[PDB]
Design an enzyme around this catalytic site. Structure first.
Site, PDB file in Angstrom:
ATOM      1  N   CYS B 136       3.597   8.476   0.458  1.00  0.00           N
ATOM      2  CA  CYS B 136       4.667   7.498   0.263  1.00  0.00           C
ATOM      3  C   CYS B 136       4.353   6.604  -0.949  1.00  0.00           C
ATOM      4  CB  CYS B 136       4.893   6.692   1.551  1.00  0.00           C
ATOM      5  SG  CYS B 136       6.529   5.938   1.560  1.00  0.00           S
ATOM      6  N   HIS B 137       4.130   5.311  -0.725  1.00  0.00           N
ATOM      7  CA  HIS B 137       3.695   4.405  -1.799  1.00  0.00           C
ATOM      8  C   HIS B 137       2.170   4.389  -1.955  1.00  0.00           C
ATOM      9  CE1 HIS B 137       7.824   2.755  -1.195  1.00  0.00           C
ATOM     10  NE2 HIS B 137       7.754   2.585  -2.502  1.00  0.00           N
ATOM     11  N   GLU B 168      14.188   4.527  -3.144  1.00  0.00           N
ATOM     12  CA  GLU B 168      14.397   3.081  -3.250  1.00  0.00           C
ATOM     13  C   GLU B 168      15.866   2.733  -3.461  1.00  0.00           C
ATOM     14  OE1 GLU B 168      10.192   1.643  -3.516  1.00  0.00           O
ATOM     15  OE2 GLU B 168      11.772   2.109  -2.068  1.00  0.00           O
TER      16      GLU B 168
END
Lengths: 234, 235
Positions: B136-137, B168
């Site tokens: 993910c991030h 996003e």
């Protein structure tokens, strides 16, 4: 909006039991249908204009759903295009915006030497089109040249395709050694590209690297076709 | 015998326009921990500060079920015992672990690019022939992550995936990334000499193995990424 799907033209011996290899029909059925449902008019092509089904993967033994009907209905969109199959040297590349390289174990024989298909694909790519390939399809990349630089088209790229572990699982890795055939991974490293593997040989696994799109297998045909369409408008 | 280290984002402060705080997405750590444990890895948690918090848009009770729910809610489960024992990064001995796994959530946008202690542990694990994984991030931790053998960023010349900007935009938080001057995984890849490879959809189970660098897109990818991480250790 036209897409061009290449088939392997080789349908001679391969398997140890005398059975012949060739095209895996599921690959072209899924790809043809996905393109045409997304606004593309699809033509087929091979290096020789001819082809055959892999004998261990006969259509009626593997085809299901609505592409089973598409194959069997003689007057379907799929059959009209397949009967109209083109010979590579007679094809005008400027007609097409997407080149999709379907396979089967036959691609091991003709694709690395398919100079006419390579010419078509490299020209489509030169004009800002997409090159897509699944399974053994990336073998067409061996000798595939960027018109401008003369270097391999896939140099500095990331690709996927049928892994060596898949061949071992199928029991054909020995045939690869006997008949002096290669792997997608070898073609990647030979041409300055990086090869990225799926977890399993049967997974739906795909990669978009710019306008070069690759997939692992027939189970990846739909996803790779979607990737190709997305890439064209990127 | 074999140990894995899962990092959490330290940040759990303001992010969303509705006043909600961000932080950890619990599904990420629950699924990765279980997969590591079922494959015989003992698992410890860590963050840069030693603290963490659940993202308020993704509170555990609203997003967990089955044995994920059971593992979270059972007081003395292996998951809870390890989470209550969450380590502080500067106190961790890197040589104990063969796999580093960076879980995320939007909280990773704030601390991960500058989490120098987490970055130290990961680099050392990598140098000792181990695996670096991130979902993910999570790959934001790669920003300025130095390979001790090269002196240059660890992910340079590597292929990675992670949470796409497309994600996003769909979540409607892309404007917050501009306001608060936060980055994306793609931008971290290109800044550190890596190639970013996108999933078809931001919600896909999508993962990449490049040598001993392993990446996934999201919580739907955490299992596949953990499997890839384990497989890469013996490659």
């Amino acid at each position: 909006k036209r897409a061009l799907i290449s088939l392997t033209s080789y349908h001679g011996p391969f398997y140890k039991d005398g059975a012949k290899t060739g095209v895996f029909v599921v690959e072209i059925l899924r790809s043809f249908d996905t393109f045409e449902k997304h606004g593309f008019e699809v033509d087929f092509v091979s290096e020789t204009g001819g082809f055959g089904w892999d004998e261990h993967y006969l259509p009626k033994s593997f085809i299901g759903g609505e592409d089973k009907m598409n194959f069997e209905t003689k007057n379907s969109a799929f059959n009209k295009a397949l009967a109209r199959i083109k010979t590579a040297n007679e094809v005008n590349a400027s007609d097409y915006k997407v080149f999709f390289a379907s396979a089967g174990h036959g691609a091991l024989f003709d694709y690395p030497k398919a100079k006419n298909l390579q010419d078509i694909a490299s020209k489509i790519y030169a004009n800002g089109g997409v090159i897509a390939a699944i399974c053994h399809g990336p073998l067409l990349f061996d000798g595939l040249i960027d018109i401008k630089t003369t270097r391999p088209l896939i140099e500095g790229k990331a690709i996927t395709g049928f892994p060596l572990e898949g061949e071992i699982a199928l029991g054909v890795d020995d045939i690869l050694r006997s008949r002096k055939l290669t792997t997608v991974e070898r073609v990647a490293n030979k041409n300055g590209a990086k090869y990225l593997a799926p977890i399993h040989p049967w997974d739906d696994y795909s990669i978009t690297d710019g306008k070069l799109v690759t997939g692992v297998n027939a189970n990846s045909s739909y996803s790779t076709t979607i990737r190709a369409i997305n890439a064209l408008y990127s």
